């Protein structure tokens, strides 16, 4: 749940693509079947993270809490929303929410990875 100095990768999957209708065959995220059906409001209100990695194993009773993300190097920090869990080593199904916001002066893009700190946080929506 609490990992620091993480040599993080940047696999930011692309939600928006299909208005978050994850139900769409080829995608099907953990809560897709339940969440894809929520009116655009909540869905877009916050960002989006189908989460993955090594530390922070939270799949089952996870689709309800948030993941806080900070970049010590620049000071950039945001609150993420744990929606799904992947098994191939990504990070999040962002594209526009965490990386795309806490990206630095291109470092992240120039390398394909960065060093961050993330802690599980409850957003109690």
Curated annotation (Swiss-Prot):
Family matches, as Gene3D superfamilies: RlpA-like domain
Keyword Transcription regulation set for record: no
The protein's role, per its UniProt record: May be involved in a defense mechanism. Probable plant lectin. Binds weakly a chitin analog.
Lineage: Eukaryota, Viridiplantae, Streptophyta, Embryophyta, Tracheophyta
Species: Hordeum vulgare (Barley)
Pfam families: Barwin
Disulfide bonds: 31-63, 52-86, 66-123
Residue ranges crossing the lipid bilayer per the database entry: none
GO molecular function, one term: carbohydrate binding
Positions of the Barwin domain: 2-125
GO biological process terms held by the UniProt record: defense response to bacterium; defense response to fungus
Keywords assigned: Disulfide bond, Lectin, Plant defense, Pyrrolidone carboxylic acid
PANTHER family per the UniProt record, alphabetical: WHEATWIN-2, WOUND-INDUCED PROTEIN WIN2
Designated name of the protein: Barwin
Keyword Aminoacyl-tRNA synthetase tagged: no
């Amino acid at each position: 749940e609490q990992a620091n100095d993480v040599r993080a990768t940047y696999h930011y999957y692309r939600p928006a693509q299909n208005n978050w209708d994850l139900g769409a065959p080829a995608v099907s995220a953990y809560c897709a079947t339940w969440d894809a059906s929520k009116p655009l409001s909540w869905r877009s209100k916050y960002g989006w993270t189908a989460f993955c990695g090594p530390a922070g194993p939270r799949g089952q009773a996870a689709c309800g809490k948030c993941l806080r993300v900070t970049n010590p190097a620049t000071g950039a920090q945001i609150t993420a929303r744990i929606v799904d869990q992947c098994a191939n080593g990504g990070l999040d199904l962002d594209w526009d929410t965490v990386f795309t916001k806490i990206d630095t002066n291109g470092i992240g893009y120039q390398q394909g990875h960065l060093n961050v700190n993330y802690q599980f946080v409850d957003c109690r929506d």
